[PDB]
Structures are given as structure tokens and as C-alpha cells.
Ligand binder design. Sequence first.
Ligand SMILES: *[C@@H]1O[C@H](CO)[C@@H](O[C@@H]2O[C@H](CO)[C@@H](O)[C@H](O)[C@H]2NC(C)=O)[C@H](O)[C@H]1NC(C)=O
Ligand SMILES: *[C@@H]1O[C@H](CO)[C@@H](O[C@@H]2O[C@H](CO)[C@@H](O)[C@H](O)[C@H]2NC(C)=O)[C@H](O)[C@H]1NC(C)=O
Ligand SMILES: *[C@@H]1O[C@H](CO)[C@@H](O[C@@H]2O[C@H](CO)[C@@H](O)[C@H](O)[C@H]2NC(C)=O)[C@H](O)[C@H]1NC(C)=O
Ligand SMILES: *[C@@H]1O[C@H](CO)[C@@H](O[C@@H]2O[C@H](CO)[C@@H](O)[C@H](O)[C@H]2NC(C)=O)[C@H](O)[C@H]1NC(C)=O
Ligand SMILES: *[C@@H]1O[C@H](CO)[C@@H](O[C@@H]2O[C@H](CO)[C@@H](O)[C@H](O)[C@H]2NC(C)=O)[C@H](O)[C@H]1NC(C)=O
Ligand SMILES: *[C@@H]1O[C@H](CO)[C@@H](O[C@@H]2O[C@H](CO)[C@@H](O)[C@H](O)[C@H]2NC(C)=O)[C@H](O)[C@H]1NC(C)=O
Ligand SMILES: *[C@@H]1O[C@H](CO)[C@@H](O[C@@H]2O[C@H](CO)[C@@H](O)[C@H](O)[C@H]2NC(C)=O)[C@H](O)[C@H]1NC(C)=O
Ligand SMILES: *[C@@H]1O[C@H](CO)[C@@H](O[C@@H]2O[C@H](CO)[C@@H](O)[C@H](O)[C@H]2NC(C)=O)[C@H](O)[C@H]1NC(C)=O
Ligand SMILES: *[C@@H]1O[C@H](CO)[C@@H](O[C@@H]2O[C@H](CO)[C@@H](O)[C@H](O)[C@H]2NC(C)=O)[C@H](O)[C@H]1NC(C)=O
Lengths: 588, 588, 588
Amino acid sequence: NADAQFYVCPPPTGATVVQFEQPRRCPTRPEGQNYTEGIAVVFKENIAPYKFKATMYYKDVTVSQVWFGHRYSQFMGIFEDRAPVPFEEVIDKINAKGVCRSTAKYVRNNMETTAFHRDDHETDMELKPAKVATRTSRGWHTTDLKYNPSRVEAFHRYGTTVNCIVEEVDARSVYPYDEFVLATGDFVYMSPFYGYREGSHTEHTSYAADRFKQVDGFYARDLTTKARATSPTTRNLLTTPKFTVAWDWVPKRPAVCTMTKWQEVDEMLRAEYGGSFRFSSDAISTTFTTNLTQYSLSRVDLGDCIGRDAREAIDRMFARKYNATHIKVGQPQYYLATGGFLIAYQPLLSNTLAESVERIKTTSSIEFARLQFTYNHIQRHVNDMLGRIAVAWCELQNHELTLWNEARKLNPNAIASATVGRRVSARMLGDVMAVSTCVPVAPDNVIVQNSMRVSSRPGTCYSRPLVSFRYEDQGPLIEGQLGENNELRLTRDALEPCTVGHRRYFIFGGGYVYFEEYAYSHQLSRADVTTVSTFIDLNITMLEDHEFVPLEVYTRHEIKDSGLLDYTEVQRRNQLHDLRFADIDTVI
Amino acid sequence: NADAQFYVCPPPTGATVVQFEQPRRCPTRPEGQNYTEGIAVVFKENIAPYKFKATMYYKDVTVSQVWFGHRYSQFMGIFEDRAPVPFEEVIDKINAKGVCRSTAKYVRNNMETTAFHRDDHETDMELKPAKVATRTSRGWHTTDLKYNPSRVEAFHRYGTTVNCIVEEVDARSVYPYDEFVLATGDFVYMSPFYGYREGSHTEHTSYAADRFKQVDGFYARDLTTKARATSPTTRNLLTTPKFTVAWDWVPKRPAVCTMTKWQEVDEMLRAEYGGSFRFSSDAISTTFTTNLTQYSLSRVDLGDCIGRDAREAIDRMFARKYNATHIKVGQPQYYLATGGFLIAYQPLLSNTLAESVERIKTTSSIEFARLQFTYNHIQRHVNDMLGRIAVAWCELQNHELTLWNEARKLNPNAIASATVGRRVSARMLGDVMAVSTCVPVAPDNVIVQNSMRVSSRPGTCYSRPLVSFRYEDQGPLIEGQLGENNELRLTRDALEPCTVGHRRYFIFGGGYVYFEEYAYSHQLSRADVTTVSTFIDLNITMLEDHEFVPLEVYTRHEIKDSGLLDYTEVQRRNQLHDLRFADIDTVI
Amino acid sequence: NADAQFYVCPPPTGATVVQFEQPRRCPTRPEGQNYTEGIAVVFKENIAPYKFKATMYYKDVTVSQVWFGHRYSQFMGIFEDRAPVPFEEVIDKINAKGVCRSTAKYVRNNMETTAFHRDDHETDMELKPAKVATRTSRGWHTTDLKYNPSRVEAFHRYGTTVNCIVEEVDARSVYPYDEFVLATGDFVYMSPFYGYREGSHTEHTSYAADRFKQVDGFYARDLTTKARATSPTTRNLLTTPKFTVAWDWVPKRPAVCTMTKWQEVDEMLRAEYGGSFRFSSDAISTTFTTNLTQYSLSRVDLGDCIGRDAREAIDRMFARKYNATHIKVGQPQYYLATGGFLIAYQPLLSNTLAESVERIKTTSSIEFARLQFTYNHIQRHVNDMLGRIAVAWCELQNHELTLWNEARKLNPNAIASATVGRRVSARMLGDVMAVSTCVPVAPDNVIVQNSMRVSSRPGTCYSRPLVSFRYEDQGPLIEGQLGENNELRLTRDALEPCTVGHRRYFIFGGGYVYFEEYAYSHQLSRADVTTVSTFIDLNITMLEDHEFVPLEVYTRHEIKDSGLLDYTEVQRRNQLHDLRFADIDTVI
Ligand SMILES: *[C@@H]1O[C@H](CO)[C@@H](O[C@@H]2O[C@H](CO)[C@@H](O)[C@H](O)[C@H]2NC(C)=O)[C@H](O)[C@H]1NC(C)=O
Ligand SMILES: *[C@@H]1O[C@H](CO)[C@@H](O[C@@H]2O[C@H](CO)[C@@H](O)[C@H](O)[C@H]2NC(C)=O)[C@H](O)[C@H]1NC(C)=O
Ligand SMILES: *[C@@H]1O[C@H](CO)[C@@H](O[C@@H]2O[C@H](CO)[C@@H](O)[C@H](O)[C@H]2NC(C)=O)[C@H](O)[C@H]1NC(C)=O
Ligand SMILES: *[C@@H]1O[C@H](CO)[C@@H](O[C@@H]2O[C@H](CO)[C@@H](O)[C@H](O)[C@H]2NC(C)=O)[C@H](O)[C@H]1NC(C)=O
Ligand SMILES: *[C@@H]1O[C@H](CO)[C@@H](O[C@@H]2O[C@H](CO)[C@@H](O)[C@H](O)[C@H]2NC(C)=O)[C@H](O)[C@H]1NC(C)=O
Ligand SMILES: *[C@@H]1O[C@H](CO)[C@@H](O[C@@H]2O[C@H](CO)[C@@H](O)[C@H](O)[C@H]2NC(C)=O)[C@H](O)[C@H]1NC(C)=O
Ligand SMILES: *[C@@H]1O[C@H](CO)[C@@H](O[C@@H]2O[C@H](CO)[C@@H](O)[C@H](O)[C@H]2NC(C)=O)[C@H](O)[C@H]1NC(C)=O
Ligand SMILES: *[C@@H]1O[C@H](CO)[C@@H](O[C@@H]2O[C@H](CO)[C@@H](O)[C@H](O)[C@H]2NC(C)=O)[C@H](O)[C@H]1NC(C)=O
Ligand SMILES: *[C@@H]1O[C@H](CO)[C@@H](O[C@@H]2O[C@H](CO)[C@@H](O)[C@H](O)[C@H]2NC(C)=O)[C@H](O)[C@H]1NC(C)=O
């Protein structure tokens, strides 16, 4: 007790008047974003090589030189070479009959060299299947054993082997498609699209004209089944210095593409704001950003697959999910998104609402677009809910003004003190409130009287306790009456008829003063009285800090290590052989 | 002023009565998600090859042919070959004594060829350490110098070199482990697990039976220290056409695994909703999703490491962090998560409680699971806090009704107008409120009288100003009295005794009208009076838009370029040699 | 109707008194995080090889052996070798005059071998440009055609070719830079920084001293234009067993670096909390975390580029964006961030406020730092807005107390019931409220009287309906008067003068009871009366669940397959050749 201040308040006068702030104009809900519904196909930069089937035709020519010492034989040398099979032989012997000449006649080191199997006369040898090995393609050959000369004591002799080999191999080529490789690791410096017809003669070739041939209406004969193909092809044949390679010719534009279809999105919402389109997919949790102008497909080099694949996928998705409820609005539109993604977009409309060239470079990481989706999804919800709270809060403040301007007529002192921000006396001057600042009085300078009975006129009593006080620690003593909430009135006018059973508690300092039968009893602290709350609880807690550690499924070291052989390490090791096991400096 | 409407309101009648909406049932704080506490071990698809130590044994056989011209010597040819060391020599000469025969006797090109070092008689040569090189493994050899024939003017002569080489090399194999490679780049077309015992003879082998040998109880002798191993091994030996390779045989199942332990999580919470489990780790900020049914380990090909590694890690983590406060509930459980992660989970409980085969394919990106964790963490907090606000808001609206139904008794006109949404007169008909719509009056049609004194009975005055007005711009003039907030009463009945010091402000149009001693003074604008606010401020602001740009630490081009040599570029360049520096077409 | 409890309320007494909870201390808006403004440069671990230009000098020596059979010629062998060009020839013939000797004299297999082009006398041959090929570097050679011996029936003859070749090639080297590779796939076991001067003789070399030479003041002569360089260089020349290689010598430290500049951030904010710095960039949406202590650059092996690049970029960004408005505070600071990113940071200040060695390992994924930025950005906004709502809510609850303690004087029964939480009678005992629990009465035990007229004194009427009731289903019948909200009073004291037009509705059970001219009319349900709401609506909805699926632009299989040739697949296929097309076991 005796900690809270007391106050004496003079009667207010028109010298200072106040009014309550009138209702504020409440904010409006921000208008919801307009989304165009649509179907989309997202394309990425093509990194995969163009793949096709090819067939190699060559003869393994081997010339061994043997020395016949006493009771032992020794190879003095083994010359190994690959000779190309001529076109006449590929067409008239291999494809027509499944045989090869037992001789190899070809140009090597600027000389026309000729080899004969076993050094015998030329004969047509039957091609037969190679021994099976796992994961390899088909192959055929004419000979299993190497031929070596027969013994002649103390002589050096030579023996020739000629094995005609045929192999089906996968061929690979990368943009700009001016050369290709075979599964054997052999390069071919000619475009896989090179030919005579349809302007294909302008494609790249590093070889002389006579090294190339194109056969129209060619029918392949299978070497194992001996069956002839049902339909013809345009067969390309190229004779390199080491082998002849054949493959089916096809037009370039419909075969290759610098873009690859990546995602088919049947629910792609398009929004427009800030001079850009936002294409968001709820299924893949991704948001792409683009300029408002379409990207002309004429800018894409070899982009013919884009329109073709987009139209097929869009029509398929539309038929599967929308044919019964929506319509297509115009033809597909193309947009280039940040990160190098090309989006083919088909806008839709519900039935109920129907009244020079370059290459795009795609990033390897989509995470920026998934963070964009996630941030936008959360931001939109938080801004919506906080916007609703801001509106409701303003409406509540305006609505309660009706209670405040009614309460002020009942107790202007309390309402003025609560709104002005300091203890004041107040009085209504019609429709405005006059105010005056109250003077504080220390709790030590007040004394309550022991009785509320009016001795001067029995049967009448004071409504509130009589009090005695002084403005300063030393000075005159003033007689007054206790008012509401530590108020000290300069007049003893609050009177009532005395009634039996009188019990009262009045606020006195930081506690209460109890009275019975118009006589003092004792002081109390607020803790002595039962407390009930007019407050509605709201337990809001902050979202705690969180630390994201670095995390990878496979480190780049594990990715480098997953390869069975590392060309760099094999070469480093093999080239150290002479430095480890020989002497590169001593001369004899 | 004249910038606001006036109103005349007829006395209400029981024709229209209203009541206040009774307290609404407030929403309940939703029940929190139940979490099982547990320890987890997350496994990913294994991409690393199986690694083991092997030893190669071969002889570098070299036959040089030299021409001895006048005052100069010239190599006419240098034949180089690698011959395998026979099993008898690997066991009885190399491993037993650290020596090799100075001869090489082997099969090449279907012939039994024999070579002698320096063309001398056979002798046992001592193996000695190879010259040191950085980053390479150990190696031994018998000879440093190449042997070339001695000069004989105008003759072609031959000279043989045989260098026995032994090398320790790293071997690698990938699933299904049917072949392996050596650090030299050489392939071995046999499973590293092939053998005779324990059903290992069913493993793959491309070689004839006599090319393989298995020595039980083999003791390796170190070629440098000459020390014999303390414990024996089962030694596999395979003679290929180019070299003999040896390695220790081990059972397949305990050696390889198609899954790899990736993360050990000591605090993995498991929630269940929507027919799926959500495994979340606060430490790695990741949430995995799975079906409710366990994944049977019997489905995993070669998955024996999963149970073994999971049990070891779970027990280790439990001992370190939980032995004093929790218990294990049942045996470890296995669940396959979206993205191809296999989770081994051990449920825990506080001490205070309980009274054909496949290959899993793992994604290289964990970001979907980290976005899932982040979104769930934010969503859960926002839904909790907004849920608490929704509850408190409803509780407050219900609580406030007690003040509203008390305020309506004091001023039914203002309270009815504030709740009905339009200006009306009102009256309490017991426990309901009768209402009637007020007719507007333009401010131009009203005139206030200059005095509030009652001339007919001095000493009495009007409580509020007398007013004169008309309903229409031209029509009869009606005499009345000013009511509250621009109300116009049709009766001059509000009276009081006249008192000295009378000062009053009354609402008049968009401002006030001041009076002194019951006589008019002047009009005022609301801006002329001091304003105090009954409103509690709340400054909510929207979360701004944010653009995420693409960002990579290393682009795939930088990753590709990080390799020292590129096999494709080296081959492309080397195969162009004849097209650049020679003539592949001219014939002489 | 007759579906809600009635209550008999006894007069309260001082046996139980209550007070309202006094205003709570409202929470404070937490102090905002302080941010130091600055410019930053982020460095990552360097993965790119050191690249430099080199020139190879070698002679392609070819010795063919031809057999001249009747009407055909055949190669018996073709020995091919690469011989290094001596220093005297590179300097005095090639660089001085653009010619090579037509002979090759070099050491091979411990013998000094000499070859003569066409077996003719030595002559100086002119180097001329090689035939053009796409994507290859420059090259020169002396000879186009291979030389083969002329026909001599039934003889074996030998022919020598010597083609001097010069090629400009790209050289690559990786840390620790102790060796390098050429574009041809050839390794050089010497540091590219090796030399004599400036302590460079301490660098690695696997070659003998006489195999290396360094020419100071060397002037390169272009082989095509014949023009001599304007400025000299220090030329390194190394003769390996297969070729001579030359390159310009440069000091190591300024040429290589173990770190690479990755991002230049002109707006990097640095915050400090929890004993760590947080460097956030709004432009790249990334937050890096570091310890408070700077990372000493002296710890970085070969880190000289870090200081140089940081100072250049910081000064450039400052000049472009800050020179007119800020100042630099001290020299650049270096901090190592989680994930292995080294941050060079330059603190700034606005003009208005101016009064052994290691190698850092960088993660390939930045996503943890982008999640960190995103989470922090959302968390900070949500905590700010919810913090403001918590403050405003408390301020509102405290402000409303002024209305509550005024309403209790008007209707203590209703206000006590609303705050205590159960139906009670109440009375003000001065400044505290006395309370007493009301006893319930079932609606079935209540009967209303048909008239409100006081028969004993005409002209006077009861203010509220007269009622009859019993406490139990069987017992004495008590006469009383209807109070507020289903209260039953034990005294018929509420009286008024009877007036014309009397109409009233009183709460009776879950409905109302209507009266006219002081006589009963009928009962009504609440639904029969027009309802108006005192509640402010707030429609909060939960943020729905969302599932993030795995998503990748390119799978690791597509990345692996993007390479044109795969060394592992080519070797696997080529080493199977004999197992497929030959017989490795048969002996003849
Ligand atoms: C979102 O789309 C709606 C139509 O669905 C647009 O609303 C129309 O706006 C104009 C201009 O104010 C009015 O004349 C129409 O009467 C509105 N139509 C309807 C049905 O209300 C709106 O402008 C669009 N908003 C944005 C941000 O693009
Ligand atoms: C969207 O359009 C803007 C131009 O309005 C493009 O921005 C330019 O891009 C080029 C290439 O990077 C730069 O050379 C220019 O300096 C940029 N200008 C500006 C003002 O920033 C932007 O690349 C387009 N984006 C997409 C996805 O199409
Ligand atoms: C306000 O809400 C928080 C929860 O957000 C309450 O804190 C939890 O209290 C229990 C009981 O002591 C603890 O076991 C939990 O660990 C606490 N959780 C957190 C996240 O701190 C808090 O008690 C509530 N306060 C009030 C006054 O109701
Ligand atoms: C979450 O776990 C709690 C126990 O911690 C479950 O609560 C019990 O639920 C039953 C059925 O309604 C009641 O009989 C008990 O009285 C509850 N116990 C307590 C302590 O409240 C709850 O059912 C679980 N909920 C879910 C969704 O799993
Ligand atoms: C969880 O179980 C569901 C089946 O209830 C699995 O979904 C099926 O997966 C196959 C193979 O991808 C598809 O062909 C089916 O069309 C799917 N069915 C449905 C109804 O979607 C799902 O793969 C399982 N997930 C995990 C992580 O085990
Ligand atoms: C409401 O809060 C915002 C901050 O969220 C206050 O905005 C600042 O206003 C000043 C004055 O225009 C600017 O100098 C600051 O740059 C603003 N800060 C931000 C982050 O925008 C705003 O003043 C507050 N409004 C009220 C009425 O208090
Ligand atoms: C953040 O920076 C501000 C200055 O912009 C610091 O504010 C001072 O804080 C102390 C301690 O309460 C006060 O005595 C001063 O009066 C404040 N200065 C001003 C100009 O307001 C503050 O210390 C900093 N806080 C942190 C966490 O770094
Ligand atoms: C920041 O400083 C702390 C030490 O105060 C470093 O923490 C240690 O990191 C190493 C390597 O991971 C561990 O072997 C130690 O056990 C860690 N010590 C402790 C007490 O945890 C931390 O690596 C530093 N981080 C940065 C980015 O510099
Ligand atoms: C509260 O707000 C929600 C939106 O957050 C309203 O829900 C929409 O209601 C219409 C009509 O039923 C539907 O067509 C939409 O699909 C709903 N949207 C969502 C996101 O659910 C809801 O009607 C509002 N409730 C009240 C009482 O106004």
C-alpha cells in the first residue's frame, strides 16, 4: 500500500476542449491476381548426341615374321593393319551373298598394297557370326585362326592372315553435326547427313569425292538370317583409310534438334505483372519468369522438333483433361524464360466463360524457380491473411467509437484520462469535452477519517470516506472527500441516508480501505481480493532461428569416381612406364 | 460548414424490431501433430565401384631389328609385346624366391613363341624395385637396359630383350560385377568373385578353365622386404593373353552392396497423415515422404550391407545419446522414400512412458526434401499463430456483446445506427429494439436561433439550440430543437434552469456551433478543436516481391573442363593427323 | 422455446468480492537487427586447370618393308616412331630459318639411331603449313608423301620417311603443378614453372639435366608470316624421348591460384548475432555464415590472386556506385563461410553518418545458403508483423478496461456473469463487486401470468411480466417477477404508470414473450425477430499442404551420356576383339 499517487483535480473550464478522432477510412483487400489457365510444354537445351546405327566393313590384315631356331620358334615381328572393304565388295559380295574375297587390296602409305589369306589364291570366304560377348552388338568374320609359316630350320619366314570383319555399331554425333564417331572410338570426318539429294551435298566432308558413294533403293540382307529387307533405304557408304562405314541417309532437319522436351504441364497458370509473365505449375512447384513478347522460333537453329512436340503434347493433354470443360484460345505461344527454358503455352477458357539464328543456353539448376514458387506461395498467403487482419482491426476501432462516446457521458474523468494519456478532470460542454490537468499528491500526505456518519444531522452519512491531506510535506491541512480511483475532492457533499448492513471497499493508494456500518475497519492490498480478468488472451510466439547446413547426395568427387576408368589416370600411369622400368638416357 | 447531412427521425413503433446476434461458437485450436521420436540411417543408391588390390605379372618382350650402314645405325623395326608369366613361375620362382626366368614362353597368334633375354641361355634373374615416381604404386623388374645386336657392317640383325615386370595395381568393378579393370587400363573378363568354393563357380568368366587357378593357403612374400605374410589367403590367378593377374578371393555378398550409407540422423521425427509417413530431421533440414508399408530388404539385390550398417549405426547413436533417457521400441524398420532414399528407422520411447530383385534409383538432388522441410516448418507456425488469432478474435467479439447490449439502453439511436448500418431512430420495447429510418435534410435548409433563453418563463433555458428548417428547398418552415449528431427534433422540450458561466459546443453540419450565456457566438470547423484518439494503432505492411536469379557454384561446362585430359578431344585431334600432315589419296 | 435455463438470484453479500485485473505491461517491439553495409567478392575453390600455349617439335620417322611378288606388292611391316628435334635444330634451323634437317638422329632403346629421308644425303627442308582442319591449332611439316622403295621383283626392300612436324598446342596442368599434358594426350613430367632463375629450380622434374634448356632473350619467328616477335621471352625447351616441347617461362605465384572469383556483390549486408556473422545479398538471394575471426590469407596455398582480384573488384564497384555517398571503413577483411566460400568484405559508411598452408574445399551446392536467405527473409517479416499484432492486442485489452469498469456500474449482474464465467448476481460495494451464484430452474417449472395490470391500484402496471415457478418438479409454487435474461425475481416491485400503445417483448427461455396493453399475446422464437450483428468478421484460412516432387534439369545419366566418346566403353569393346573374332587358346 501507499505507493500509488493521489490526485486533486480542479473543475474544468472551456480553456481546453477535446474531441474524439472520427472513423478512419479502412483499407481495402488488394485485388486478387488474375490467372490465365493453360497447358504447357517446357523445353531445355539439348545436351544428348544424335544417335544412329552404322555398319563397319574392314579386313584385319596380319603379317607375322617367325624365326625358327633349334627346338624353338620366335616372332621377330607382327605387323597388324585394318584395310577398308571396297564398295564393289560390300554391295556385290557381302550384301548380295554374305561372302568376302580372301584378299585385301588397298592404299596405305601412298602405295597400293595387296594381301592374300595364307598366301594362297583368291577365294570367296563365308561370313559367320562372331563369338558372343555380353553387352556387345552383332558381328561376323571369315576366319578364327591366325596363319603362321611352317617350320624351316634356321630361316626367317613370313605368313599372312586376312580376316574380313563386319560389325553393327552405334554411331554418335554432336552439334553442328559435321562429323561422327563409332562405338570402336573411330572418328568419321563427314556429316551423318551428307548426301547428294535435297541440298545435303552442302554438309561437311573432309574426304575426296571418290571415297563416298550413295545407293538409292538399297535392300539390306541380314548376314545371320539371310533374309532381305522388305523396304528399301538410301544407303551412304564411306571408305576411310582404315575401314568402310555404311549408314542409312535421312534428312537433317527432322532428325536433330537443339532443344529437348523436358516437362509436360497440364495446369500452367499464367499471371502478368511488372511487365513480365509468371508461369507457375502447382504440380512441379515451379515458377518461370518471361518478358511479355513471344520468342520467335525462327531464331532457334534446327528447332523443328519444338513446334512438332509442343503440338502433339498439348493436343494429347487437352483431350485427356479438358475436352469436356474448356476450349483452346488461339494457337500455341512461345516464351523464353529466365534460366534458358523455352515454354510452349496454350491458353484455355472454361465453357462457362464462353461469352540470325542462335542456341538457347539452359542452366543446370532449377532451384531458383522452385524457391520463386515457394516464396510466392507463402508471400501471397501471408499478405492475404495480414491484409484481412488489418481491415478487421480498423473496422473494430471504428465500431467501438460508439461505445467510447457513450462511456464519456457516464464518467468523463476516467475516459478523458484514458484517451488524453495523463490524469485529468473532465466535463461535457455539450458535444465536446473540457479538460484540466490534475495535481499529484504523495500517498504519505493523506489521512482518512475514522467515520462516515454526519454528526451534525443524524440519519445521514457520507457516501465515500472523509479525507484530510496536504499538497506539500509541510503546509496547511485541507479537508475533503475521497473520490473514484485516488481522487481527492475539495468538498464533503457526497451524502446518503444511513442504512443497516453497510459494507464498503474504497480504492486507497495501491490497495483498498474497508468500512462497516459507516466506520473504518482496515486497509487491504489488491492481492487480498479475488481477481477476475476482462482481457482476452492471445499467446503469439516468434518463429525461431534455423540453420541450413550444406547437403549433397553425391559430391562432385563421387561423381568423378563413379566412372570405371579415368582416361587421365590411365594415361599418366602408362606414360611413366619407361621412367619406372627402363633407362631413357644410357647409350651403348 | 454545411458539409454533412442533417436528419429528422419519427418516433419508432413496433412495426420493425431487431435483436443482436448471440455469441458465436468459437473455432478450436487444432490438435498438434503427433511425432514418434527415433534414430535413422538414410541410404542412397551406390555409384562407387568395388575396389580391391591386384598384382600383374608379365614380361616386356622386345625384338629390335637394326641396320648397320656406313658410320650410322638405324632401327628397321621394334616389335614390342607383353607375355603372361605362367602359374608355375609366379608360385615357384616369383613368390618363392623373388626371381624370374630370363625367357618368355607363351602363346601368341595361335603359335608357341619363345624369347630369350640377350639371346643367351636361360637364367634366373632377380627382381628389384622400379625407379620411384610420384602417385604410383609399387613395381619391380629384372632389367633396365634394352639389348640391341652388336655392329656388323652392312647387315640387318635382331636382338631380344625380356624384362620380367611385377606391379601392384588397383582393380575396379561395377555392378553386376561380371568383369573388372586394372589401373593400367586393361580389362579382365571374369568376376572378381569367381572361384571354386562356396558356389562361386557360377560367377561369370569368359576364359577357358586352364587359364584360371586358385591356391588355398597361399602366403604372399613381399618382393622388397623378403618377408612372408603371417596369415594365408585364397589366391586367384588368371593368365590372360597379355599378362597374369592375381588377387585375393573373398565371398561376394559381404563385399559389395547396391546401397551406400549417406546420413546418420540421431533425431528423426516420424509423423503420419494422409496415408503416408513424414520423416523429418531438424539437423539436416530435410523431410522424406513414404508409404505406410515397410520396404522388404529381400527385394534389394546384394543389399546385405543395409541391415549390417543400420544396426551398427543405430546402436552407436542410441548408446551415445539415449541410453539414459529412452528405450528402443521393436527392431529397426525399413521404408522407401520418394526420390529413392531407403530409410532404416528405430522408434524410441521416453523412460517416463509405457506405464524377383530390384535396384533402387536415387535422384541426385535433395532440394525437393529441403523445400518440403522449409515449407512445412513455416506453414505449421503460420497456421498455429493465425489459428490463435482467429480464436482470440471470436472470443473478443463474443465478449464485447456485453458492452453493446448495455450501451443500447443509454443511447438506442446511436447504437441502432451503428449496427443496422444506416441512420435510424430507435427505442427499447423491453428486450428488443424498435427502429425507424430517418429522413435526410440538406444542411442548406436549416437555420439556428440566436438564443436559448425561454422568454415565456425567465430563469429557464433550452438545453440544446433551437432550430428552424424545411424538408425541401422550397416549402413550409418547421420549428424544432437540435438533437445529438445532426438530429432535428420536432419538439422544443429539452429544458433546464439557466445558470451563469454557460459555455457549450454543439455538433452542426461538418463542424460545431458555440454558445455562451444561452446566446449564439460562432461556428467552428472540426479542425479548430484538439483531437484525441480512441483508436489503437496497428501498422501491418505487406511482404515485398522478390526475384530469385539462377545461381550455380560450378556450371556443367566448368565441371567438364575440370578434367586434365578429355578422351574425345584427344582422339578427335590424333585421328586428324593423316588428314593434316599426310596425303591419304595419292598413289605411286 | 422452453429450451434454456432460468435462474433465481439471491441478493449478494460481502462474503465474496471480486476486482478486475489491472492493465498488463505490454511487450515491446523487439529492436531491429543492425546491418553493416559493404561490398563483397565471393571466392570458390578453383577446379579449372592452369592453361598455357606450348609448341611441339618432332620428326615422324617411318620405315616400311615391302615384298615385291609377281604382279603385286605387299607391306611386310611399317615401323612408325616419333623422334625429338634437338635444341640446336629448334634454335638454329627452325626458329632462325624455318627449315629442318632431312635426317633424324636420336636415342631409342639405349641406341643412337639415325634415319635419312628417302635414304638420301642430308638437306634442309622448308617447313610449310599443314592442311586445314576445323577446330585444330596451327601446324607445319616438311613432307606430304610417304617414301617406299622401288620395285625389284622377288625382293624384300626397306624405305625411310622423315617428316619434320611442328605444332602449336594447348598445355594443361593441375595443382600441385608438378607435371602437364599436351593437347595430343602426351604427358610431360616437369613443372610448367621449372627454370633456373628466381628459385624455380626447386620445382619438380623427372628428367636429366641435359634434357632441359632455358633461353633468355628469345625472339620467336612465326613460321607462316616469317615475322620476328617484337619483344623477347624466356623460352623453356625440354627434349623427351618422343618429342621436344617449348613454352614461355613465367613466375609461378602470379600465374596460378587455388581460389577463383565467383560473385561480385555491390550490396552485401553484414549482421552479427549468436557469435557469428551473416553476410546476406539481396541481389543473389544468398546468406553466408562465418565465425567472427578473420581467415588469414597466409593460410591459403598459392592464394595471391585473392587479394589482387578482391582489391580490383572492390575499388571498381565502389567507384561505380558509392563514391558520391559513402566512404570505405578500413582495408578489406577476409572471412571463411560455411560450405567453403571465402568472402572478401569491404565495410562502408554513409557520408551522413561520418561523425602450414591449406586448401579450402567448396561444396558444389549453394542451395543451403539460398534456403537460409529465404527462411530468414520470411521469418523476419512474420516475426515483425505478429510482434506488432501482439503489442496492439495487449494495448487494446488494456484500453477496453475503461469501458468494462463503467459498464459494471450499469448492470453488475451481466458484467459479473460475463467475467466470472458462470451466472451470478452482483452488487457494487464501493469500488469492488460482491457476487453470489444464481440457482438454476428448469423451463418446464415456470408459468407466466396473463396480465401486467395492478388490480389493487388501477392506473399502475408492472414494468416486466409477473411469473410463477417452482424449484423442483414437485414442490411449493413461488410468485415472482421476470427479470433480465431469464432471471426470476422473488419480489413484484417493478412498477410504472400504465400508458396507451404499450407493446413489449421479453426474453423467455430460448425465445421471447410478447405483450400488448399490459396483457399477454404470444411467444416467439429468436428466428422470428430480425437479427443485426455487433461482430466484426475476420475470415482467416489455413495455408494448405503442398508436396514437392523430385525435379532435375539433367539427370546424372544424361550428363554422363552428353560426352561424345566414353573411354570405358571404347576400351571394354576394343579389348573384347580377340575373344569375339579370334581364338586365344588353339596352338598349331
Ligand atoms: C482481372 O480480371 C477482371 C475480369 O474478370 C477485371 O475486372 C473488370 O474490370 C473493368 C475495369 O475496372 C470493369 O469495367 C469490369 O466491369 C470488370 N469485370 C468484372 C466481371 O467485374 C480486372 O480489371 C482484372 N484485374 C487485374 C489486376 O488484371
Ligand atoms: C527480357 O528483356 C530485357 C530487355 O528489355 C533483356 O535484358 C537485356 O539482356 C541482354 C543480354 O543479357 C543484355 O545485354 C542487356 O544489357 C539487358 N538489358 C537490360 C535493360 O537489362 C532480358 O535478357 C530479357 N529476358 C528474357 C528471359 O528474355
Ligand atoms: C504460449 O505458447 C507456448 C508454445 O508456443 C507455450 O510454451 C510451451 O510450454 C510447455 C509447458 O511448460 C513446454 O513443455 C514447451 O516446451 C513450450 N514450448 C515452446 C515452443 O516454448 C507457453 O507455455 C504458452 N504461454 C502461455 C502463457 O500460455
Ligand atoms: C495423439 O496422441 C495423443 C496422446 O498423447 C492422443 O490423445 C488421446 O486420444 C484418445 C482418443 O480421443 C483420448 O481417449 C485420450 O484421453 C487422449 N489423451 C490425452 C492425454 O489427451 C491422440 O488421440 C493422438 N492423435 C492423433 C491424431 O494421433
Ligand atoms: C506408394 O504406393 C503407390 C501405390 O499405392 C505407388 O504409386 C504407383 O507407382 C507406379 C510406379 O511408378 C505407377 O505405375 C502407378 O501408376 C502408381 N499408382 C498410383 C495410384 O499413383 C508409389 O510409387 C509408392 N511410393 C513409394 C515411395 O513407395
Ligand atoms: C509503418 O511501418 C513501416 C515499416 O514497415 C514504416 O516505413 C518507413 O517509413 C519511413 C518514412 O517514409 C522511411 O524512411 C522508411 O524507409 C520506411 N521503412 C520501410 C522498411 O519501408 C512506416 O513509416 C510506418 N507507418 C506508420 C503510420 O507508423
Ligand atoms: C544498433 O545500432 C544502434 C545505433 O543506430 C545502437 O543504439 C544505441 O543503443 C544504446 C543502448 O540501449 C542507447 O544508449 C543509445 O542511445 C542508442 N543510440 C541511438 C542513436 O539510438 C544499438 O546499441 C545497436 N544494437 C545492436 C544489437 O548492435
Ligand atoms: C568456426 O569455429 C569453430 C570452432 O570454434 C569450428 O568448429 C570445429 O570444426 C572442426 C571441423 O569440422 C571440428 O573438427 C571441430 O570439432 C569443431 N569444433 C567445435 C567446438 O564444434 C568451425 O569449423 C568454424 N567454421 C568456420 C566456417 O570457420
Ligand atoms: C473465407 O475465405 C475463403 C478464401 O480464403 C473463401 O473460400 C472460397 O469460397 C468460394 C465459394 O464457396 C469458392 O468458390 C472458392 O474455391 C473458395 N476458395 C478457397 C481458397 O477455399 C470462403 O468462402 C470465405 N468464408 C466466408 C464465411 O466468407
